[PDB]
């Protein structure tokens, strides 16, 4: 499963 932060941990950006 995937978590609601996979985008944030990949970029370091939000």
């Amino acid at each position: 499963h995937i978590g609601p932060g996979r985008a944030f941990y990949t970029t370091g950006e939000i």
């Epitope: 499963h1 978590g3 609601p4 932060g5 944030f8 941990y9 370091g12 939000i14």
Partner: antibody
Amino acid sequence: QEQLVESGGGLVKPGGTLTLTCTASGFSFSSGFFMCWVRQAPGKGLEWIGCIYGGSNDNTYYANWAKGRFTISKTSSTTVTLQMTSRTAADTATYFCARDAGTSGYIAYNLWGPGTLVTVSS
Amino acid sequence: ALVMTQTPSSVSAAVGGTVTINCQASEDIQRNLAWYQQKPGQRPKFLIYGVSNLESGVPSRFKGSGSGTEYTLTISDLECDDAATYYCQSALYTSATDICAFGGGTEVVVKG
């Protein structure tokens, strides 16, 4: 195996300024994780301070109460710094270097050092 | 902001029994919930990420559950090595102050 070791804690007069060092071994500052600082006053609870990104966009992110007194920086490929200015005795605590691995897009502090003790005192 | 609140501040049970800690999140955290065990004198030990994913070496009897607002840690077959303070932790990835918030902690005392 990967390991963190904090460094620089000790006595500090109220208002004096301190710089602590964290040093990683067994892995390197790539991207996909953060290096974070957490403090814990004696007997009190875990209180987050701030993180800093691994990728070269050294994005620094602080807690509400923290910014302006604390600052986190990548001093080398293997060392991260946190610099603080004391005020109150409540700044006396153990300072923990941690790693948010961000595993599967969840928060995951899967690595912690032993912590270093800062004592605000005259 | 985001505040986590662990409800029973302390708790006791016998060896081989079972205890339940709950942690309350301000908003919908969507299962982004990590647990840690800290014995006094030591650094925190990572237990669980994402409400229920056991880190390796963490035995199965640590059952994390929950959804949305209410999450639960359930320690069964309690053993003396479980005597510690347990912390929930979650994150909202929109503001600088919500990258991390720790719960207040729950002490677990084991009766041998």
